[PDB]
Structures are given as structure tokens and as C-alpha cells.
Amino acid sequence: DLFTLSFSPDLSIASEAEQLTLQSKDDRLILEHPQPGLRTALEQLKQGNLTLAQLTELVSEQDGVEAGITFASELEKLVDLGWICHSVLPLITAIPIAKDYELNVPDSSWQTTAIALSRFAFLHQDLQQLVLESPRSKSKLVILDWRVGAVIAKLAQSDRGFIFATSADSLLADLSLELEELKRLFALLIATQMMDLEPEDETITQWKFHNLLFHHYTRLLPVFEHRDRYPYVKPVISTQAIPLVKPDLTALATTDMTLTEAIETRRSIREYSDQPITLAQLGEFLYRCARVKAVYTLPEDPMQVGESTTRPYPSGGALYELEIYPLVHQCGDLAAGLYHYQPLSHTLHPVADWTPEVESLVYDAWRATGQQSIPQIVLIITARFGRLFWKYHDIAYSLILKHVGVLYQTFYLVATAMQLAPSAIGAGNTTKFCQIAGLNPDEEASVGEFSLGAAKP
Amino acid sequence: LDLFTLSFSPDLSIASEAEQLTLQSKDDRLILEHPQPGLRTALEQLKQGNLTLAQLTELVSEQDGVEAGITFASELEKLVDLGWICHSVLPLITAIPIAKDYELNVPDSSWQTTAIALSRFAFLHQDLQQLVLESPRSKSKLVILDWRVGAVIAKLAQSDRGFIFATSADSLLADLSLELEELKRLFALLIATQMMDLEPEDETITQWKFHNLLFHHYTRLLPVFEHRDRYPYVKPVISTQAIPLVKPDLTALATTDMTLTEAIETRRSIREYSDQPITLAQLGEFLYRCARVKAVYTLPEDPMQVGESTTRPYPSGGALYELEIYPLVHQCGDLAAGLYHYQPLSHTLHPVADWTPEVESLVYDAWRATGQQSIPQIVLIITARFGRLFWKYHDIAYSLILKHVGVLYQTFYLVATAMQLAPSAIGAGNTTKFCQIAGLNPDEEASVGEFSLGAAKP
Ligand SMILES: Cc1cc2nc3c(=O)[nH]c(=O)nc-3n(C[C@H](O)[C@H](O)[C@H](O)COP(=O)(O)O)c2cc1C
Ligand SMILES: Cc1cc2nc3c(=O)[nH]c(=O)nc-3n(C[C@H](O)[C@H](O)[C@H](O)COP(=O)(O)O)c2cc1C
């Protein structure tokens, strides 16, 4: 009905003398002894330039009227699986992106009702073609004609209320599109959840564009080709290294706080004591939190992972991508500046001295901690993205954030066990740290911050 | 050559007082007393926003003097750097700054004979009541004042291979009524605002997906809890039939349980579960030690009207713990198969659905995501009631939720290690399947994490 039906490009059509297979990635559908015409209708759906009425007529020409009605009933089964694209030629093509697919041609009242483009719909270049996408939609709109882009630009630029019955004349005057083409285009836009028939919704008003997009995309064999580029430990920044103490963990396995006691007594302490946190305390903290316990290589890894490290915290598929930069503003045995921590050698190498840029970062952390007292150490957790981006297409950054949270909890518990003053940070400036430390922001950028010091008795 | 219109930023506040003049922004403010008439005329025309830098310089030179004109031309670059000046090609497009240390560089004329293409991170969307082109790699935001610019961007994105202006500009000038000079100004602005790629992207950026880079750029850059009554401190009880959970003596566990160092050094992801499933008392102790409610309090002087807030064994941004735990049980000691919801204040379990094929589908998804090791015993699904946290944090809300999920993962790992359980986090799951299972709005509460728990073999 008022749409041209085409099979999804990922669908494979296996033609046998007495059976027929339609193969997708997740599932497949096989049917035995198909009468001709049904096979002809499926072949022309693979061609994908006919209407449902035309396909039903093709079935009826060879099989009969009852078989045509049966095929008309059968087609919605394939529509539900998301195997059938709906197009207004040659203007736009909706391809499904999710199962349990449903297309709903709206009532004619849309022509006299105020509408607007969803603020979650966005136009971008998928590869070599312009596409309209939305997290609120189970469809993906390939734009075949730039005049559709002009229509979208006109109505997004339009006022809050767009009434088709009154404003369609301006569109027919500025563009060469016919009225029926425009009505089909707007109908498909509304049906693919790209348009708002209602004025506003209280549940989605709280959501931001990037937040909702990230939530929808992350919540739904590769090879590490750049393994030589991204090693397990980051190459040494500066060879001048300050050693850190290594505590005997066997004695601390009995001297330290009980896990239950540490969990029940942990609190965020932002008022630091007068005696700053010592370098030995920082060394013990880093050794108990983010050290390298052992370096291993899987005996049979098809992904060419090579060497991977084990650390006190977990990470998705190993591939520990977190570096710790202990920016020191006030330490007992160290001068002010930004440093970098190496987990395998248990050393810290300086990155920058006490420049007003490092001071800007310190001031940001101090304001984010509530301006209770002057920070002593600020650990900045940075993510070398090339470590795991190859293995996870969409779920990479959420995994990185969850690892940052794990590291936050470990920091909290260890600092509570060491009578320190821990406090996580909500967010920071990634470009400022990219400038201070000289990093490739598309290859390694800061993703977390934590404030650490000494707590008064 | 200078070919852009300078306007005052809409985000900037102009304080016009007697004998003084103030330009107020969020990060910085610039005040100046005794302003000369030429500077005043230039600032007024910048408020108008219809002159180029050369025109403003000439006006300042005619009103205050030539040296004063040069001084104003030097001074205006500092205001441009702070992101206070928008650059527009009227009436086609206006670039507004969105980041400090702002800089606009008119590209060399060679761009007309060089192949270019639209950045795949540039996206058009409707913001407020106007069309806007944005990009995480750009320091600017383009307000599209004319739909013909949208048609140009559509033709450019639709165009295949490389687009060379010198060869293909004739088709754009013939299909649309835009003038050649207007088209060159538009393309110059697009190239200068990092919206166009003259090089084949880069190997480091190819690793990045659109949504990941957008989220990373937006998150890593007093409100009032108006809807507090809709999103309370504990979620309202789903079903009145409630199963109680065992409360362990935490004063005794404060000395009997293993040390924190022992738990951190012994912890590991265990996926091979025992033949004897995890009991209900173990699940109760686990939930009581991980995500129970310890106390309900109210801030003595809270201007945000936060109201009631709870304390819990794990930390969370600004308190207001918005995470709920649904323990989907496939095989437990004294609990039938089905989905449940954990109430931490009463320390209870309330059923949500029985062993339906969709609960089994969730179990199958978790089992495949955990490597198909034995059979899963309990799967905790961590969900986030967004309305409790979204009011306070606009952009960093979801990142805070993910970090909270990570904190809860680490707490689960440590407590399960201390209790000789079999913990294992899960990378991702199906949020819409869980939304279909439990009658919840996915825009108000949706699954954001998964964890698998069972018993470890001796
Ligand atoms: C992800 C995350 C970010 C946080 N960011 C901040 C912050 O920016 N400033 C701050 O004072 N506390 C921050 N905190 C700590 C919380 O404010 C703290 O958990 C809460 O205010 C008090 O909980 P407590 O019992 O640990 O003291 C953060 C905690 C987490 C988990
Ligand atoms: C955020 C996150 C997600 C994870 N997702 C999975 C998963 O989906 N499947 C799985 O088997 N393990 C998962 N894990 C556990 C890791 O695979 C595990 O840490 C690693 O493979 C082995 O480390 P460990 O045995 O020392 O704990 C996840 C861990 C984290 C932190």
C-alpha cells in the first residue's frame, strides 16, 4: 500500500528445485515445495521495485486467487522480522534495523495536525549516502533525493507548529516535488517514528540527544591488527623514573582491614589533613590498586592478542587500557606537576612541571570536590582506546566507563584501608589533559578523575 | 582575505551601564570603563551583527583614529579567542563557538580544486526551533538559516567519490538559486569549522564510531528536583507478595571476613558453577552486604529540594542512588525460576514474572555472553531509574550511571570472592527484552548492566 517493497540487502535467497531458503545473520526461514508465482513474487521482492498489490497479482497469475490472499497474509510475517524495506521511489527508503518490525501508515488527520521533526532524528553520511537515523526509531532512512533533504531542512527550520494542509503550498512552490510524492514522504516519515504528532512527552524530555543515542546503541572473529601499535603497557614517556615502594602483600593480607569493615566504613573524605600524603603511601596505593601481577601470553589466541597483563581489577576481555597519571600538587617527597604511573615497573615518570595548565586542572578538581580543602594528589585515569576498540564496535566506551567505575571502587576501598581521603570525580576536561600531557585525543584521552590525600584522625 | 560577518554570541550577556561596559560569560568576564565612542559604535554594530572585521576596523578608525582602529583590530582577536564572536554568511549559515580557545581559519583557495567530502561525524538535527549542524571534532555549531544550505549539504553527502568545487560547482549553481560568491563563502565556512574533510580522515579516527565519539566529546567537556515525588529514594513495591532475605551479622563479619587485600588478590571471574546451586541465604547475605539501604536521611539545608536520600555500601554521585537490582533466578536454592526485584530498605524480593520463554531468552543471552560455561544460576540485572539522576546532571548523567554500574560490579566481585561465590560481569544485554518482560517505560528505567552469580566448586 502506497509503498514499494524490497528485501533487506543482508538477506540471501537460496533457490532449490523443491525448497527455498531466506538467510539472515540471526535466523533463517526455509519453505518446502513452493508453487511458482510465490517463487516469482519472492524473486521480484529480491528485485524490490513492486507494490504489495503487484506481488499479490504475480502470485495470483500463476497460483490462483486464494494463494494470492495467502501470500498477502504471509508477507507480514517477513515484515515483522525486519527483512522488508519500504520505499518512496526515488525519494527515500526505510530499511529495518530491529526485529519485531512494524510500519504504521498514519491516519489522514496528520495532514491537518501540527507536526515537527523529532529532536532525536539526525542526518549523517553512513558511507557514500545520506541517512536519517533516530534512537526512537526501528528504521533507517536512506535519502535517495536531495529534495527530501530540502524538505527536512525546511520543516526543521520551520516553527513549532507545522500543518501540512496549510504549509504544503510553500513546499510545492519552492520544490519540484509532486503533492502525492510529498504526502508519501511525510507518511513514511511519520510511520518511521521520525515525526512528532504529539507536542511533547514528559518521559523523554529529560533525555539528552547524545545520552539517548549512546544508550540505544550500546544496549543493542576480529583480529588485533594494530597489536604492535598498542602494547600492554604504555611506552616510557620520560626515562627519568622515581621508584615506588612495594609492600609485602602476605603480611598485609592479615594486617589490613576486613573487607566487610572496609565496605561498611568507607566514606568520601574531602577535607585533607595538614600532613600531606607521602610518596610511600602513594606507592602502596598504586601497588595495591593498579599494579601488574604477571605478564602472560595465551597459548592459542586467534585474535593475535599477544601479551596481556593481569591487574587487581577486572576488564572486558583483558586488554587493560587504563593508564594512571598521578598529578601531584602537594606531596611529601615530590614536587608539583603531572606524572605518569607504569604498572609493570612500579615507577612514575614526570610529564609536566607546575605550569598554570596543571594548576587549571587542579582548580577544576578542587571546585568539583566542593572547595573543602586543597587537593594533595589527583589521579587521572586515561584510556588508550586502540587497546579494545578493535574487539568491541559499539560497546567499547561503556566498557571503559565501567572499568573506570571499578577502579573508583578499588581506590575508595584501598584508601579507606590506608586511612587516606578518597573521592571520585564526576567529570573532567579531556582536551586540557590532551594539551598538558601531549596525547593523541583520538588514540588516548582522559576518562576519569579521583582525588586522594591524608585524612586527619 | 576577510569574508565573514562578525556577530556577538547569543550565550554572552551584555551589561550596558553608565560609563562602564561588561561582557559576561560562564567561564570569564570582561569589564571596561571609559569606553571611546569608536569602541562603543563597534560593539553596537557587533550586537547588530552585519559587518565584517574590516568594516568594524574602518568604523573605529573613522570615529576614534587610525591607531585606535589598529588597536581595536588587535583587541578583537582576544574576544574571538574566548568564543564570544559568531561568524556568519548571511542569510545562509552562522557558526557559533561552543568551546574556549576559539579559532577560525579561512582555508587557502586551493580547496576549490581539491577533492573534499562531508565529515561522517557532522550531523544535522533540530535544536530548539532551528536546524543545526554539529560535530564532535568541531569547535563550532552551525545554525542553518536557509534551507538551500541544507540542500547543498544533502547533495554533498549524497555525492559519491570526491567532490571538487571547481568542476562540480556549476551543477549546484544551476540546480539552486545560490550565487557563486555565496556558495564559496558557505564552503569556506564549512571547511574552516572542521565540518569538511580534505584528507581521507585518519587511521586513529577510523577506530571511532559516531555515537562513541559524540558521547565522549559531550560528557568530557542550581538545579531543583522538581519531579522528586515521581522518583523516590526507593522504588515503590511492584507486588505485595514479598519473600524475606536473611540479614547477616555485620558486626561479626567485620572481624571474621577476609581482609580487603586478601579479597583483591584472590578475586577472579568464575564461570564454572557447582552442581549444588547457590542458596537463598547466600543471595540474601550478598544483597545485604552489597546494595542494601543502611539509613534514610534528609539534608538539613538543601536548596535543590532533594528530600529523602539513602546511604548504601557503594558510592554514587550526589547520593540519590538510582540503581535497582532485578535478580533473575534460573536456578536458586529455595526460589522458583523467574524474574524478581530486590528491595534494599526492607531487604526483600518481589516477583515480576515467572519462567516465561522470554525470561529463558534472557538466560540464554547471558549464558552465551558468559562463554557457555555450565548453566547460569543467578543473573542480577542492574537498571537505572533515570528520572532520579537526570535532573542534576545534564550531560554526564549516563556516564555517571555507567561508572556506578562499574562500582557495583567491583563490589559484587569482592563480596562474592569473600563468600566463595562465582561472580562474572557481563558486557552488554538486551534492554528492550527486559523492558518487554517488566512493565517499565524504557525512557524512565532501563537495564544498564548484567552480572552472573553462583557457587564455586571446592
Ligand atoms: C562516579 C562518581 C563520581 C563522583 N563525583 C564526585 C564529585 O565530583 N564530587 C564529590 O564531592 N563527590 C563525588 N563522588 C562521591 C559521591 O559524592 C559520594 O559517594 C557521596 O556524595 C557520598 O557517599 P559516601 O558514603 O561514599 O561518602 C562521586 C562518586 C562516584 C561514584
Ligand atoms: C565491564 C565488564 C564486562 C565484562 N563482560 C564479560 C562478558 O560479557 N563475558 C565474560 O565471560 N566475562 C566478562 N567480563 C569479565 C572479564 O572477561 C574478565 O575480567 C577477564 O576475562 C578475566 O579476568 P579475571 O578472571 O582475572 O577476573 C567483564 C568484565 C567487565 C569489567
Numbering used by the authors:
A (entry chain B): 3 to 222, 233 to 469
B (entry chain A): 2 to 222, 233 to 469
From the manuscript:
Using this protocol, we selected 10 projects solved by S-SAD phasing at the beamline, including soluble and membrane proteins. Structures varied in size with molecular weights ranging from 14 to 114 kDa, sulfur contents varied between 0.9 and 6.5%, and diffraction resolution from 1.8 (detector limited) to 3.4 Å. The overall multiplicity for these datasets was below 26, which is four times lower than the multiplicity typically needed for S-SAD at shorter wavelengths (100)10.
